[PDB]
Design a binder for this molecule. Structure first.
Ligand SMILES: */C=C/C1=C(C)C(=O)N/C1=C\C1=NC(=C\c2[nH]c(/C=C3/NC(=O)C(C=C)=C3C)c(C)c2CCC(=O)O)/C(CCC(=O)O)=C1C
Ligand SMILES: */C=C/C1=C(C)C(=O)N/C1=C\C1=NC(=C\c2[nH]c(/C=C3/NC(=O)C(C=C)=C3C)c(C)c2CCC(=O)O)/C(CCC(=O)O)=C1C
Lengths: 503, 503
């Protein structure tokens, strides 16, 4: 099995896990076009007999009694001689689908509606930090659901994923700082998770039981189960979970204005069950997290812009206090250095180029200054990778991964190189998984050990992107209160001319 | 209309409204303490004879069968021969209470909770800022209730009332931007509003039926009903609610980190009944609005401050471009006004006074510059009421009600000042509904006048308080960010004179 997954569609496997039982109705007859293989236990007749019979006869009276209310709402309690069963309606490909789920034996009088929502929303009374908000949400989710581990992901612009918050019981390895490639999650999976809020993987050991028409004749395709919540997982992802060691999963999809921002993944080692009320409350909890994250991301970006301005401001205090600027940058290296979130600065101002922080060598920076002139840059230049644009520094990686340049003078070549380290260097290596387990897995698919490589070779020779705040600060320092720099140059020159006349 | 209102104890009034009935119990013997006058219809036997009787025969057998069940939830729906009835239990004064309320005929099986919650949440998908958050929330709450006029109230630091947004159908009076003094909400009422989220006005027309006995013997005062949601309101508020003509109200409280930031008070001209599914939905909606309101408030700042810091930047571009400071302010007189959110600005860099915007004449400016030097302020002087701090300028405070002054020179007396207009002038006088009412009110207890008239005299010689961002910008103006850029003009002039007369 090679090159599998992305080619394979995931909405048309035609398989159902043994958790529930589904049937397909169509037309006034509501014929049993598609039936399950496990319906023998509940219906009491062989599935092939069920085929080609009217829905009124086949359905037990318990389900038929509240069928109108079931269509009105889509969820109500029906008690069978075996026991009570959750019932739902979902329309796919023009055919209605009746879904039956084994409800718990609990009387359900306890854990009433809307009180779990209060229990979940109470701890979030504070929650300043976006990362700390995700941490608190993970804590509450773990407290309610009882799963071993809760992890929260953020998706990068190119759909690279990382882990932000992690709430877990003591004992298992921490997964904070994880980075996994965008290709780990296929496009169709992202679309499906966008469409439906919750995904439940009841048990990994369970062998899927397929519905038993081979192919739908009228459609020519297996029945689509995208809306249905009983979709069977892909075998590749099943082996993923088997290698990782998690068997029951409960995944929540965080959406910011229709964009899949990240996922909450509740993981447990053994198959567990969750009540219907808890899941219904968790859907609302997902909506709350979506809204709160949508607001707080804007809050954090505004705060970062304000801090960038309030950091660029004091730089005018040093230059203007009397001390020469070339000594001033050495005096105040940190503030000028962190105006863009970069690690190296190099300045051309008329004299020999000056270096602050980790910067490329003298020959390298002068060659870069020579090379930058022919390209017409109206105000500034933004680049993500330097190897493609500039061959000579492609070999250099540790001080040549990122570049940001602004020309201080419109005519004269005044170059302000800003180098930001490679994404793999700026991110703490404490974020890697490490902790090598003794058993040897396939090492190609599973995340433990045999992963995090695709990230490092996909983003190799690439630095973290220059945010809107980063380029705004780049322009601001292209000025750097351009009055102070231009007027100190002019003032020094015009005092020097008077001194030379006095000379 | 007697003996004012502040001394009146709301907590201890112990009144029972028209619809529901109450009865108290003590200990395992559950001695009956108090009864309502209207319970005889529901109980079927005279209330006076049951004083101190056992619950076995006073109360119908069905409630006693569900007493242990009612204790768990604290509220339950039960079928009674008269009809469905809804009962509650809670603790007050060491004495347990049983409350009975008329019940809606719906068995709470159709359109249950946790599916209208998403109906309320979905419109909030946008709401880029606080104002539209409140607008959308008010609109959707109005849609849920079906009431006539929803309203939102905001309180200042000194508890003065604001009206941010409202949603109304066509054909009534609007009070957007209308103002009410802090004393309109008694200090007794604020703590109670903090304690419980929801309070419902059952019927304004119906007089409060008395509670029997008139007073409990053991305590000497009627038992309080803070936990109860049926507690009757003051007779003083009956005249108010009659004057505005509303019949029922449904008060929703918005608390941020334990403080009454806002208050939602729906109004309906005629009586209307709301089910507890809706009530338990809107209490969740208040808990909802709390967090998102905090988030949007916290996001609004650090963006206004960022814009002010960025706004100060082009003032530097006014320099370097050919011209002096006088000419720089001549072309750019607009931008310097919003640097501190003040309509007038004055500067004194050593020469004759120069003014921008509507500021006091130069003689009083010189007088205040002379007077501020004896007053010890190291970096800035932020006074909200000028007359209290400085008598002579109290006479003309239309534009000099509030001032922010900074010393340009470190030791010498060089000043930069900003003058804000007095309040009421800045606010949009839209609080008047126009259309003087054909009925004649007392002009002291109604929406227009009485309220917003005591408020105006309460905030005479007052301006919006100097926040953090405007003073930060003001101190940045004097700080070595643009002040040094101003100083460099002196060195440029010095080099010009060095070139002058010597060539
Ligand atoms: C060629 C594509 C795939 C290779 C790569 C592979 O191993 N699986 C592929 C496709 C699918 N991924 C599905 C679900 C899924 N996989 C991940 C990957 C992870 N990266 C990590 O660090 C961790 C945790 C340690 C994981 C699990 C994720 C995040 C997901 C989303 C759901 C989940 O978290 O389990 C998948 C099934 C569809 C779906 O459930 O979305 C296919 C097919
Ligand atoms: C000190 C006595 C009072 C006079 C003064 C008065 O006008 N109100 C007094 C005390 C109480 N006010 C109560 C309710 C209430 N009052 C307001 C303020 C307003 N100012 C206005 O101009 C308008 C008209 C639009 C109003 C409504 C508000 C906002 C409220 C709460 C709204 C509500 O009833 O839900 C009151 C009873 C408290 C209660 O149970 O609500 C007292 C006592």
């Amino acid at each position: 099995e090679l090159s599998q997954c992305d080619r394979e569609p995931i909405h048309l496997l035609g398989g159902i896990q043994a958790y529930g039982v589904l049937l397909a109705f169509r037309g006034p007859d509501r014929r049993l076009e598609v039936v399950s293989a496990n319906t023998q236990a509940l219906l009491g007749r062989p599935p092939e007999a069920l085929l080609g019979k009217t829905a009124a006869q086949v359905l037990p009276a318990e389900l038929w009694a509240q069928w109108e209310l079931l269509s009105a709402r889509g969820a109500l309690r029906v008690a069978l001689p075996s026991g009570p069963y959750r019932a739902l309606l979902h329309e796919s490909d023009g055919l209605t689908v009746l879904e039956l789920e084994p409800a718990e034996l609990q009387p359900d009088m306890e854990e009433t509606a809307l009180e779990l929502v209060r229990r979940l929303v109470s701890p979030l009374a504070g929650a300043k930090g976006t990362r700390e908000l995700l941490q608190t949400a993970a804590n509450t989710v773990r407290a309610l659901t009882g799963f071993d581990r809760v992890m929260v992901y953020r998706f990068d612009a190119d759909w690279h994923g990382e882990v932000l918050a992690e709430s877990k019981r003591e004992g298992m390895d921490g997964f904070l700082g994880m980075h996994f490639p965008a290709t780990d999650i296929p496009v169709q999976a992202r679309a499906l998770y966008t469409r439906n809020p919750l995904r439940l993987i009841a048990n990994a050991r369970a062998r899927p039981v397929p519905l038993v028409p081979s192919v739908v004749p009228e459609l020519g395709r297996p029945l689509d189960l995208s809306g249905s919540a009983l979709r069977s997982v892909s075998p590749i992802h099943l082996e993923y979970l088997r290698n990782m060691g998690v068997e029951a999963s409960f995944s929540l999809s965080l959406l910011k204005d229709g964009a899949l921002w990240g996922l909450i993944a509740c993981h447990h080692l053994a198959p567990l069950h969750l009540s219907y009320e808890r899941r219904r409350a968790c859907e609302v909890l997902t909506q709350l997290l979506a809204l709160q994250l949508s607001s707080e991301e804007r809050a954090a970006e505004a705060a970062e812009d304000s801090h960038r301005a309030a950091l660029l401001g004091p730089l005018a205090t040093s230059l203007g206090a009397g001390g020469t600027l070339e000594e001033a940058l050495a005096k105040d290296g940190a503030r000028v250095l962190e105006l863009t979130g970069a690690t190296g600065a190099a300045l051309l101002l008329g004299g020999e180029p000056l270096l602050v922080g980790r910067t490329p060598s003298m020959d390298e920076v002068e060659a870069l200054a020579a090379w930058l002139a022919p390209q017409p840059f109206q105000t500034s230049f933004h680049t993500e990778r330097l190897g493609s644009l500039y061959p000579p520094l492609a070999a250099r990686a540790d001080v040549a991964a990122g570049l940001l340049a602004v020309r201080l003078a419109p005519a004269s070549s005044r170059l302000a190189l800003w180098f930001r380290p490679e994404a793999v260097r700026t991110i703490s290596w404490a974020g890697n998984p490490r902790k090598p387990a003794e058993p040897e897995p396939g090492h190609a698919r599973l995340h433990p050990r045999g992963s995090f490589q695709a990230w490092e070779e996909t983003v190799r020779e690439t630095s973290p992107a220059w945010k809107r705040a980063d380029l705004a600060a780049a322009e601001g320092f292209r000025s750097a209160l351009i009055g102070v720099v231009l007027r100190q140059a002019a003032e020094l020159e015009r005092l020097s001319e008077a001194l030379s006349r006095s000379n």
